[PDB]
Design a protein around this ligand. Structure first.
Ligand SMILES: Cn1c(=O)c(Oc2ccc(F)cc2F)cc2cnc(NC3CCOCC3)nc21
Length: 343
């Protein structure tokens, strides 16, 4: 990190100050907690996405999430997971440290601007599960997996964005909620990493049919659509719903049996139907895991147990830690300073 020369440019109505190596900066749009620009990295020859974080140390919540995102991106080193090519600040010291810029691969499209074959579905879902196995192996949950954070290149090579990171944007007929596990949508319980597997199920179904699986007009309508497909919960699951209020509402609903998935997904590969049945289980305890799903017959042509790596241990003790703004800021600066680019 032998200090490069920085230059200034106005882009997303703020001034961006970036090393000379990054040229031809052009806005892509909004990212998680900041705006994103496309650029050409003259050092590596890669087309890159550069995210400038907005007000990264404005509050404790902002400072902690800035540290969180940096920690997450620095840890992730997997073909199917967004990772960090570079991180920089124009600041020369902790004292003047105010801005954080994050750099990753520029991707061609997301899964939204791709669909509306079974072999393509196989490859796409395989890579999502491969990436999820890695993320989950580090005790990280995505929590908000959806087509818009699944980015793909021209060769259909896929990377997962925005892992591990309001009510109004969750309201109504919105894609922001359509892929959410019911237990997290309705805050039933302390949830596990198979919330992400529910999301994969929804995504896979949509790739297969060209249609949203559970296009609910609101939380309640969406629950009804879900329960019509998978059945109303039994006593066993009801017990696990620790929210007495949520549990009480569920029991008010007329009981419905699980539907026949072969009659729902007409003409689909029987192995795809089988996998969907194992992913779209209401009881999260009983959902197929990413590692288990990779071994399912549906992915026979792609599955390789020696080419599906797990992550190094990820220390997130910081998550249960209470610190001041300047403390989170200092930790973040340390991580910026210690960054080593990938080979
Ligand atoms: C929307 N978006 C991000 O939010 C994003 O976040 C970052 C994460 C970590 C970093 F170090 C830096 C980041 F910029 C990266 C990103 C890459 N490629 C693309 N391609 C678009 C995908 C949708 O179709 C148009 C091209 N979009 C992206």
């Amino acid at each position: 990190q032998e200090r490069p020369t920085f230059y200034r440019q106005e882009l997303n109505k703020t001034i961006w100050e970036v090393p000379e190596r990054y040229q031809n900066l052009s806005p892509v749009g909004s990212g998680a907690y900041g705006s994103v620009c496309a650029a050409f990295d003259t050092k590596t020859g890669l087309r890159v996405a550069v995210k400038k974080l907005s007000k990264p140390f404005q509050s404790i919540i902002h400072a902690k999430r800035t540290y969180r995102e940096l920690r997450l991106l620095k840890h992730m080193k997997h073909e199917n997971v967004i990772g960090l090519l570079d991180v920089f600040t124009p600041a020369r010291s902790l004292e003047e440290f105010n801005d954080v810029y994050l750099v990753t691969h520029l991707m061609g499209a997301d899964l939204n601007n791709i669909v509306k074959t079974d072999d393509h579905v196989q490859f796409l879902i395989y890579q999502i599960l491969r990436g999820l196995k890695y993320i989950h192996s580090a005790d990280i949950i995505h929590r908000d997996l959806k087509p818009s954070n699944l980015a793909v290149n021209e060769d259909c090579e896929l990377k997962i964005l925005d892992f591990g990171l309001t009510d109004d944007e969750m309201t109504g007929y919105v894609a922001t909620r359509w892929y959410r596990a019911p237990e997290i949508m309705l805050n039933w319980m302390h949830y596990n990493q198979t919330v992400d597997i529910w999301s994969v199920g929804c995504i896979m179904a949509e790739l297969l049919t060209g249609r949203t699986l559970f296009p609910g007009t609101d939380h309640i309508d969406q629950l009804k659509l879900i329960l019509r497909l998978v059945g109303t919960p039994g006593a066993e699951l009801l017990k696990k719903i620790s929210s007495e209020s949520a549990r009480n509402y569920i029991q008010s609903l007329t009981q419905m049996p699980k539907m026949n998935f072969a009659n729902v997904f007409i003409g689909a590969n029987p192995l795809a139907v089988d996998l969907l049945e194992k992913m779209l289980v209401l009881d999260s305890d009983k959902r197929i895991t990413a590692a288990q799903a990779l071994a399912h017959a549906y992915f026979a042509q792609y599955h390789d147990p020696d080419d599906e790596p797990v992550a190094d241990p990820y220390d997130q003790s910081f998550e249960s830690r209470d610190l001041l703004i300047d403390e989170w800021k200092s930790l973040t600066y340390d991580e910026v300073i210690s960054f080593v680019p990938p080979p």
